[model samples]
Target: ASSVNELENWSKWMQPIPDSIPLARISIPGTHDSGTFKLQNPIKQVWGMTQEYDFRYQMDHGARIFDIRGRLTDDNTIVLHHGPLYLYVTLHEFINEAKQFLKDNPSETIIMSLKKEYEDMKGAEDSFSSTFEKKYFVDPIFLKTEGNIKLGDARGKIVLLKRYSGSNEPGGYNNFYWPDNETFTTTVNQNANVTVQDKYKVSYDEKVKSIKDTMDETMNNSEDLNHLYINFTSLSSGGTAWNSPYYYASYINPEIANYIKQKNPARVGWVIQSYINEKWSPLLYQEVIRANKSLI
Candidate 1:
């Protein structure tokens, strides 16, 4: 039992390992819909229960991967949003916070998945990259080029998981491949050696089964300590199932965390979650990163 801030300074714990280790060979905590924290009773507030903390807090608590969706504002400003509901935080501010965090802690890296939505806003440009700049991103070369990205390549940077168009500009920084859809289709399950399985059913048992199965599949892929894996525990609602992620995470995260604990330390990719609070994510960090206590 320790303060949330203690764990937030995750690099203090993560930096001890050698630079040769590929990032995928380590288990990292991730946030789902990372920007939607502290909604002041906005539209779809109840349904937009993706996270209980904001990106800054989540980052402070060792959340390395952030699932952020944004929209171009009328004044050409980029702001984060979940569906139609505005998160009321400027994208520049979010990026700035990350940059500051990196400056403060040079041993850690932040993985951000940036996508554009609600482009229909007033004066929104044809695409999101009308003003997008590469300077905001840490460095695309740190991304997986030949195989897995090594820790030395990404230290103290903000890794971009580009999910939008307009990759030509910024000198091909946004050229990385991303899933076009979330239907567990070929786009999501496996593309560019990055796997994302986010199929949420209404049944609790089905959720548990899917979570474990995907984790196993990612581990058994037989890749040579390379490739990124995202085992999503966030619940998504289809027409029939209005499943709240917070409601379903209870069934999966604890068991999954425990399941990850029992195994030998290697790589579990990104074990993403809705809450990602102290209770659920600490086990993931401890089991994955600190299991080799002698190294620490």
Candidate 2:
């Protein structure tokens, strides 16, 4: 089971890990903007598209966490969005996909970071959080249990990492203060702390350094199960042709993959990045998932 071939079945990569392990301690690969693959226009692709494939593709490739930004629509349904642009994908679509995946691979869990990307559409009846709690979060597929969630409790369920406010129900990770375009640390709960490196609008050198620095800390503090470290390798800037997110991911993905391969860290907490398809770096997701071999 420890062979490199086992990692090839990325959909069930968590199968071998012990159930008692808190998700915070595992090395999970994730997509930055998990639902932007439908943008076909080149102009929109430059700014909006972060994923080249669909959710099933990402799930089959070892991505356990999904960065989902959604906007409450006029019809009271939640649709995926990246800033002002609609991604043409809905929250229900994502949940359905995750549910099917989990049904097939019952050993895995999906950590979804839900954010209110833009203002609610006009003519909407309720607030974004209310609509989500009533219509979406009530589903049995979503894990209602909270606090440093364990793998056993989360299997076959979607664990919410709430990024928006006004939560009326209790379930999943609660929302906390997240400053824009910078790396910061905050508490998710009394028992759990989260350190995030999400410096998206920085020079490539600084972004890479921040990613490595946070990852180094996570590796050294691998036994600190109470803490969750999120290192985002995605970077965005001006100049669509030269300095866009895709351009940066092109370089950053391979660099971080090589770094992980060389260091062989025991735990790489929530390695979120863009452009995770084969064209980016075949070794990136594999290397991140391979680090969990120790957990087996």
Candidate 3:
């Protein structure tokens, strides 16, 4: 008999696609299965530059996010780029951008997330014609402590700011992960009135480039992508019901600490938001404690 690899000399794979050739839109975290995955966002018909994405189990251990880039086709499958990741894409933004793109280049065929026939897809067009089906529920928890939301549009795509308790003050190592449950509701399952440290307002831009940029940087690791960063905003700017407002897990109540210790460690990564409050002055600490108790 010929060796199995010898079949590679022939078009052995020239048969019907194999179901065992497992393909998944979502990736497993602990097991980086989609590492060598290559994708043509929005399908090959949409047209875009070919991109290769690898899946890795990030420290957070969430679903495997697709890291893809293509010819920027008008019908590109906007898996992560379309929102639903804390990237902050909104309905208004989608429609507005659509309006602008259509007006500027009416001739180009734009593949929308929804399947509707379009005309004359030409020029540099960005199509959002696909999305992953898995849902990522981000449940917020208080640090003892303390702070968001948005819906999806017809395209079945949504974006959120994550709207952590901190603002653009610029300097805190505070961090958080999505929670499994919520206070008065089940966030991961989609109910309102979850545990929130502090609420911040949610806003959307016609172009979620801010979010797309940050996502691209994190996934692509492009040196040329220097400016992509997260800007956590709040209610003053019209935020939403925050899920996990507590960025500093160490500062959390004992119960939360124990909970995380079992789930993660005492610290998921490292928190430094309350550094000043924990280290600077005693009076402030007393006042803050008193203030926090009020929430209880």
Candidate number achieving the greatest TM-score relative to the actual structure: 2
lDDT of each: 0.63, 0.91, 0.21
Error of 2 at 115 (Å): 0.2
Q: Relative to the unseen true structure, what is the C-alpha lDDT of residue 198 in candidate 2, on a scale of 0 to 100?
A: 92
Question: What is candidate 2's lDDT per residue for 225-266, written digit by digit as tens?
Answer: 999899999988884688878888899999999999999888
Error of 2 at 174 (Å): 0.7
Q: TM per model?
A: 0.79, 0.97, 0.18
Once fitted onto the true fold, the runs of candidate 3 whose alpha carbons sit more than 4 angstroms away are 1-55, 59-75, 79-255, 259-296
lDDT of 3 by residue, 28-138 (tens): 111111111232333321221111222211211121112221122234322222111212222233334434433443221111212111221355243322221111111
Indicate the worst ten consecutive residues by lDDT in candidate 1. Answer: 183-192
Clashing residue pairs in candidate 1, if any?
8-60, 8-61
Against the true structure, candidate 2 reaches a TM-score of 0.97
Off by over 4 Å in 1: 1-11, 134-148, 169-192, 221-223, 238-243, 279-288, 291-296
Residue-by-residue lDDT tens digits, candidate 1, 195-249 = 6666654466766677777777765653445456677777755322435666566
Q: Rank the candidates by lDDT, best first.
A: 2, 1, 3
Pairs that clash in candidate 2: none
> Lowest-lDDT window of 10 residues in candidate 2?
1-10
